[PDB]
């Protein structure tokens, strides 16, 4: 029964004049927020995206951040000036920033990626490279903790500011993140990478939340040879997800797709390849079978 | 310009009480330095401010500082005949080496005898 | 203590003027700033190091040069006479930065 927050931060240098900052948070995998670079102020994307915190203390926290934004991209810039000939353009930048929660216990993190690679994090009062991390970054980690004032008010919000906020945000949005969302599957199949053999899809669309169990089964018989995809997400929040069985050609009948989901509450979906209803959908959307993949 | 002092010039007669002011809408305004510059010289730097609100004293120099307000004053208690100099206030806009400096017009006070 | 050279110096439009700036302080940063009456000090150009040259807030007609760790010149290629002015040199490793005595620099027609 974990909670993460993380805080996404994606910075563009692509010269020594274009710069731009885009910003996402979720909660989970529920986002919260989002703050474009073209906007002037944080967007909410939930209504109770400002947690337990009134008007004229987020106001504050937002100035923090309009302030940061502005004097991060000039920061970045003045250390890439420091590294001329060292280092040069483009460059992308990218921080993940947030809280894990737990009782009452928290811990805050704040990772931060140079060209894709993760080489610096905040650790307790100071920036610090990671282990395998390359040595030119040493001098603007120097540069950055010589800075009391940042040190001191990224220490409040690692150590005060997240927990403090998620906890209001978990409760805020209780509602929300125990919804529960029927799912949805069919069946098709696809010619096998093999020679005569064939590929069965289970589709299961739009469960909420992303824990799920699909498996092809003979009877009582789960399938091991079952492969389960990765989720897709949707427009609504809702999850995405197929499970796979290859099989040879004639192999085909007997086998079912069985689907449990939480918000299901026990009864199962359970698609027979064959059905009636199997041999109803199939009709339903035949086509000329271009560009399949290959 | 992004730091303005008043008055444009200070007349005092020697021994008594000068009041300088500053206001700034440097943003982020991480320090704020008084500087006098006696003519014909370079600065020299008399104090420095640091906190939301803050209060400094070196000597006869004291400064405050309300970064809610933006505002600044220095103050010179029993001025002297050798005071007599300009006084530059300068924000700087971050805690670190990648900070830029942001000057005053500076305030000249002559001080009469 | 940082030291300037020359501390006066009058020059024709068109001249090629050389201000030398000294600090055994060993500084990091050094800053060349010129001041102007009803202004207040501003940036021309200012370095991070040996070899680092970059454009300050007014660079025009200016091209400093920084050959090692204590020097850091300031040249002007072809003087104007809009360029008299006062020019202080600076150091810095807070960030208290240091000053020089500045060049009182006069640029004729």
């Known amino acids: 029964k974990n909670y993460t927050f993380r805080c996404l931060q994606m910075s563009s240098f692509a010269n020594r004049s274009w710069s731009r900052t885009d910003s996402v948070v979720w909660l989970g995998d529920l986002q919260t927020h989002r703050w474009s670079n073209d906007s002037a102020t944080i967007s909410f994307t939930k209504p109770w995206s400002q947690g337990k915190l009134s008007n004229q203390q987020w106001e504050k926290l937002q100035h923090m951040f309009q302030v940061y934004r502005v004097s991060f991209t000039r920061d970045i810039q003045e250390l890439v000036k420091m590294m001329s000939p060292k280092e040069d353009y483009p460059i992308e930048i990218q921080l993940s920033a947030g809280c894990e929660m737990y009782g009452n216990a928290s811990e805050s993190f704040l990772h931060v990626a140079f060209q894709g690679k993760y080489v610096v994090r905040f650790w307790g009062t100071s920036w610090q490279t990671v282990p395998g991390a390359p040595s030119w970054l040493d001098l603007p980690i120097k540069v950055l903790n010589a800075d009391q004032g940042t040190s001191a008010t990224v220490q409040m919000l690692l150590n005060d500011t997240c927990p403090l906020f998620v906890r209001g945000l978990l409760e805020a949005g209780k509602s929300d993140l125990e919804k529960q969302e029927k799912p949805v599957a069919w069946l098709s199949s696809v010619p096998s990478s093999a020679h005569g053999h064939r590929q069965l899809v289970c589709h299961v669309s739009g469960f909420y939340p992303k824990p799920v169990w699909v498996m092809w089964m003979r009877g009582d018989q789960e399938q091991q040879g079952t492969h389960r995809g990765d989720f897709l997400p949707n427009a609504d929040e809702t999850w995405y997800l197929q499970a796979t069985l290859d099989v040879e050609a004639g192999e085909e009948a007997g086998l079912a797709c069985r689907v449990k989901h939480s918000s299901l509450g026990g009864q199962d979906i359970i698609l027979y390849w064959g059905s009636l209803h199997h041999i109803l959908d199939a009709q339903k959307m035949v086509w000329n079978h271009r560009h399949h993949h290959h | 310009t992004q730091v303005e002092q008043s008055p444009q010039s200070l007349v005092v007669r020697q021994g008594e009480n000068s009041v300088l002011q500053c206001n700034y809408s440097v943003t982020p305004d991480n320090h704020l330095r008084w500087f006098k510059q006696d003519t014909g010289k370079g600065l020299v730097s008399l104090t420095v401010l640091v906190d939301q609100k803050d209060k400094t004293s070196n000597g006869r120099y004291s400064a405050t500082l309300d970064k809610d307000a933006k505002h600044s004053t220095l103050h010179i208690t029993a001025t002297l005949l050798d005071d007599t100099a300009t006084y530059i206030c300068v924000v700087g806009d971050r805690g670190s080496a990648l900070g830029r400096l942001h000057f005053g017009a500076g305030t000249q006070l002559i001080v009469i005898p | 203590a940082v030291t300037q050279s020359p501390r006066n110096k009058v020059a024709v439009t068109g001249g090629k003027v050389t201000l030398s700036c000294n600090q055994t302080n060993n500084h990091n940063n050094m800053y060349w700033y010129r001041q102007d009456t009803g202004h207040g000090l501003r940036l021309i150009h200012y370095?991070?190091?040996?070899?680092?040259?970059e454009k300050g807030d007014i660079p025009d007609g200016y091209k400093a040069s920084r050959p090692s760790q204590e020097n850091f010149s300031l040249i002007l290629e072809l003087a104007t006479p809009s360029q008299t002015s006062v020019y202080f040199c600076?150091?810095?490793?807070?960030?208290?930065?240091?000053f020089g005595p500045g060049t009182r620099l006069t640029v004729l027609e």
């Open positions: 600076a150091s810095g490793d807070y960030a208290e930065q240091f």
């Open positions: 370095s991070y190091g040996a070899g680092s040259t």
